[PDB]
Amino acid sequence: MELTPDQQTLLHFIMDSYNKQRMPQEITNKILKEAFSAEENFLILTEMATNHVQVLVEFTKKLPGFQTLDHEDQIALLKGSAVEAMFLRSAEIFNKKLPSGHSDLLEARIRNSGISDEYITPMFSFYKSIGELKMTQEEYALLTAIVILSPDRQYIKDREAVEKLQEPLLDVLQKLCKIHQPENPQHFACLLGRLTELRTFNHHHAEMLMSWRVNDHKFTPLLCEIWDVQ
């Protein structure tokens, strides 16, 4: 039931790499301070997402066994998980506790950022349902690692090799779920269930970006490689 010394070592190593990401407070301070036009908000999103992918590649490289994978499979895992990891991180930031009234303002500011109405509802439906899990930082870190090391990703030549790397992370997450939420034995299944909803954002990511209420949709060369844009 308890984590082994090897698992505790794995967990702290993954926590340390995960903590290298841009701080949630930095992001919410910017959105909460003042209101921006849809044009300014689009630019904030592309810079935020560019930094996210850069740090995600650094986090992915540190995942045990990742560097032993075939180079083409490495690209396929990164490309297959980038958008999902971005929405998982956004969901984590959204659910961080803030002073009274701040989360209501954050929600209203995101709702009026320039994103199409069609996508506001499924985005907030996902954020609120992630929030009901009351996940710890370790649970978000492991889930992000599990998302990256998905063997069921398209163009993966050697699935078994990816499975071998994901399995120890799934076992660590399962133990944490039993430790953090012993009254809810369904917790682990609920976290895994949320990965299916994550996959839906990846299906409509390009349309979500192109329907942003701006006249021009400019993307960084790194974003064009990761997103199906320009």
């Binding site: 590649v57 180079h71 490495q74 690209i75 990164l78 490309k79 060369p221 790194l222 490689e225 990761i226």
Partner: peptide, 11 residues
């Protein structure tokens, strides 16, 4: 041809 991704991966 994910040249930038390949680059950040092989760095």
């Amino acid at each position: 041809d994910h040249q930038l991704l390949r680059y950040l991966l092989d760095k």
